[PDB]
């Protein structure tokens, strides 16, 4: 019909929103994920979803102690993976084992191997980024949020993953309307943002911390918001 940034243009202060988020919540940027193989990083992202970061890090250590090669996890099948995930305290062990095992046995049957290293070889052009996006999207169970996370964290490609916490804040800011689902919010940010890996990385990290730590689902901390003078929603909460 018409690109989403046309139907809802960004505000004048949008650059100041980026600079307050960065200065407040991530003045020092964490490093990118440099795992041996992008497949490790995708598994790492799955572990962290609907999880505490404390258990997610524990499951990663235990999963890779248990399966030094991802080939070992494939041979163990979803039941052994589930046992391994559950042994580290996870709460979604059956679902995630079927998910992870489905990605592995998919790679093996259709690529003869369990490696995503070919994702690194696509050109760093607009087309090549879209090639890597498409390749991640062909994997069974991997949705747009997880595609963007792996592009941003594991491949240094300028995707624009937006976390649920960040989306909730953007809507309270009325940067984007309530009608829009997560995939549209992601597309809008990818249109309004400079296509620079670092700046998008800085936004994702800073935007999550703000939405998680300041703009909480219940009882947001509007008076400590650096974005307070900009947010229409501050008056409702305060
Ligand atoms: S002003 Fe309040 S509701 Fe608006 S983004 Fe900041 S914390 Fe969230
Ligand atoms: Cl790996
Ligand atoms: Cl789990």
Numbering used by the authors: 87 to 324
Q: What does the primary publication say about this deposited structure?
A:
Endonuclease III (EndoIII) is a ubiquitous bifunctional DNA glycosylase belonging to the helix-hairpin-helix (HhH)-GDP superfamily of DNA glycosylases. D. radiodurans possesses three genes encoding EndoIII-like enzymes (DrEndoIII1, DrEndoIII2 and DrEndoIII3), while other bacteria typically possess one.
Structural analysis of DrEndoIII3 revealed a π-stacking interaction between two arginines (Arg139 and Arg298) at the entrance of the catalytic site, which may prevent the substrate from fully entering the binding pocket for processing by the enzyme. Neither DrEndoIII3 G250T/N251H nor DrEndoIII3 R139D demonstrated any activity towards these substrates. For DrEndoIII3 GN250/251TH the EMSA results indicates that the GN to TH substitutions had no effect on the enzyme affinity. As for DrEndoIII3, the lack of activity was previously suggested to be caused by a poor steric fit of the substrate in the substrate binding pocket (demonstrated by MD simulations). As shown here, the GN to TH substitution neither altered the structure of this pocket, nor provided better fit of the substrate, therefore revealing no ability of the substrate to interact with the catalytic residues.
